Design a protein around this ligand. Sequence first.
Ligand SMILES: Nc1ncnc2c1ncn2[C@@H]1O[C@H](COP(=O)(O)O)[C@@H](O)[C@H]1O
Ligand SMILES: Nc1ncnc2c1ncn2[C@@H]1O[C@H](COP(=O)(O)O)[C@@H](O)[C@H]1O
Ligand SMILES: Nc1ncnc2c1ncn2[C@@H]1O[C@H](COP(=O)(O)O)[C@@H](O)[C@H]1O
Ligand SMILES: Nc1ncnc2c1ncn2[C@@H]1O[C@H](COP(=O)(O)O)[C@@H](O)[C@H]1O
Lengths: 315, 298
Amino acid sequence: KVKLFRASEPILSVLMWGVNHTINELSNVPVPVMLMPDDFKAYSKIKVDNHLFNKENLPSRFKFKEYCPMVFRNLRERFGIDDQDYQNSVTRSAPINSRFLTTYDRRFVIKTVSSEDVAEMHNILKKYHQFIVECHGNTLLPQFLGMYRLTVDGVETYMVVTRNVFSHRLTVHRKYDLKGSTREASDKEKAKDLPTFKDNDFLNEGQKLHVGEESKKNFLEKLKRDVEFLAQLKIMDYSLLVGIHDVDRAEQEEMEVEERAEDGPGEFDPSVDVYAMKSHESSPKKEVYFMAIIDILTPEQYSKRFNEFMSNILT
Amino acid sequence: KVKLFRASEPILSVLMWGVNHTINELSNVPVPVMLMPDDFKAYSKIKVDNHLFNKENLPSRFKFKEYCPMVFRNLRERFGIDDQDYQNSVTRSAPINRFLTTYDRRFVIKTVSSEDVAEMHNILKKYHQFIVECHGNTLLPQFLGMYRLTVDGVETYMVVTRNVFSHRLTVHRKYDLKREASDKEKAKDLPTFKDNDFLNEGQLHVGSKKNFLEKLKRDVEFLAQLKIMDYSLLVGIHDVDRAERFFGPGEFDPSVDVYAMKSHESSPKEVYFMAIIDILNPEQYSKRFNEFMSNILT
Ligand SMILES: Nc1ncnc2c1ncn2[C@@H]1O[C@H](COP(=O)(O)O)[C@@H](O)[C@H]1O
Ligand SMILES: Nc1ncnc2c1ncn2[C@@H]1O[C@H](COP(=O)(O)O)[C@@H](O)[C@H]1O
Ligand SMILES: Nc1ncnc2c1ncn2[C@@H]1O[C@H](COP(=O)(O)O)[C@@H](O)[C@H]1O
Ligand SMILES: Nc1ncnc2c1ncn2[C@@H]1O[C@H](COP(=O)(O)O)[C@@H](O)[C@H]1O
């Protein structure tokens, strides 16, 4: 039961403490019939000073601000995310891989963003929300689950929590960040195991994703609505994040995994792995793809242009 | 299980919120092998500043400070009180009627002065050590928590203790024993009498007297050593017959009504309640006080 908030950095402990704290408090707040205008400019703030108390993991002094908590709570709900699950993903064990964090179970991504990013979120929040209502949470856009400001040692850090584009389980074997705007991977980037490849990289290696006509139609219809939505808001330079999971390769990796220790396959819950699609039955390699738009905080031409590219990615 | 923190006054909402918050926080803190000197100088402070959020019952801005939370949690344990139950008593419904009790009447919430808080810190280490040594068996006020609430820039200090009276059995007559009751006072639904009124009335029959006295004395010698005085014995009397699926006549849970004592078999049917209160020449005071109390037990 006991939550220790142990983490590699004090800022991670405070993140865990603050999500824990704000979600518990929200559980004592009725769920409204509708959101009101003020909810979009609301915040909670708490300042803690623990003297000679409760300091094994947390600093004695820190501050945690949550922006528009009623709105993000409604967003979680619309994205089919339970508040206790959310809280648990963040608090049961420390977020990992640091900033760009993942929750320990890899369900949620925690991004460190600028103050300008936080301002943009407020600017677009009402229209983002409404767009979410009318598409019933069916969208390739980033799914914003929470937005926070942490203060540790008098230093402010801003974070936005989103849903992971990738499968919280299935391994990603190759990834691209695509724009479609007149961009390749460095020798240094490629230096790392999972290099992030780009447009000219995707096109160069004759890459194509066969997903099947119904999946292709649904994907392109989301993409269309999404990119036109971002166009109207005047947003530029976002990308499509593409992950590729090789089913056979992962199966072998698992076998090797087990052998080293002792010394389904290509299946996912469309409910949890929300951007995942299977490769076309008549596809060379058995694969699973993860595709979603990212970085829509940091027009018309970019949308159409970025739309055409992504469209010619599928078959 | 939505805990709104609805109360008659904002200060009580904050109290409910604060007890809820600090108890919940403490459930994430390991119970230590012992208390250390630092724990008697410790505190938790939280300052809340909500804008356009969650201000249906709570003010948007307030502060809550808990003194020596490790010590008072150890006290709660040594007093046989589970933290969740304590938390539930304060928090499930608003405290009722500054002299409050929780809605279930188990705990009394006392508003005290800054100097009271100073004095509690002054005696806390010895009070604790004494509670250890007497194995929690004492007639002294049981100090369960101590808080400072800041609301509208105004600081309010509070101590939570166990109610001396039963949380159920109605009290039919009470005495403050160390002097009589004033005219206006004698004219109350339940006025408080004093030594003279007790002597004049000719009023307590019990097995237990020996053990109550063995308790009384130990405690009072402790209070003398602290050079404390002016404390009193708060006595309550439940007349069973007057009060007469359910709980029956004179029925009580001794683990909950810790000071309750039933009347002797050969007695004119009563449940009494007795404990020392208000402890925040003292040699003389103690022995006098201790002498007067022995004469009430037959
Ligand atoms: N209600 C709001 N509407 C628009 N921008 C905001 C709002 N609250 C904060 N910001 C911006 O978000 C950034 C961080 O704000 P602060 O929370 O005061 O650290 C700054 O660029 C602020 O101007
Ligand atoms: N929602 C997300 N899910 C998974 N990975 C992400 C997500 N957002 C960003 N990334 C990854 O983080 C890297 C850095 O993102 P950024 O720092 O925004 O460029 C990207 O190249 C992706 O690999
Ligand atoms: N069933 C298999 N399918 C594909 N590659 C395999 C298979 N079994 C072994 N390998 C590969 O052959 C090499 C030797 O693996 P091992 O038999 O585990 O020592 C490694 O590169 C493995 O990935
Ligand atoms: N622990 C207690 N349990 C029940 N009533 C109490 C307790 N302490 C004080 N009182 C009553 O609270 C009222 C005022 O307290 P005070 O003026 O502080 O002595 C008096 O009626 C006391 O009899």
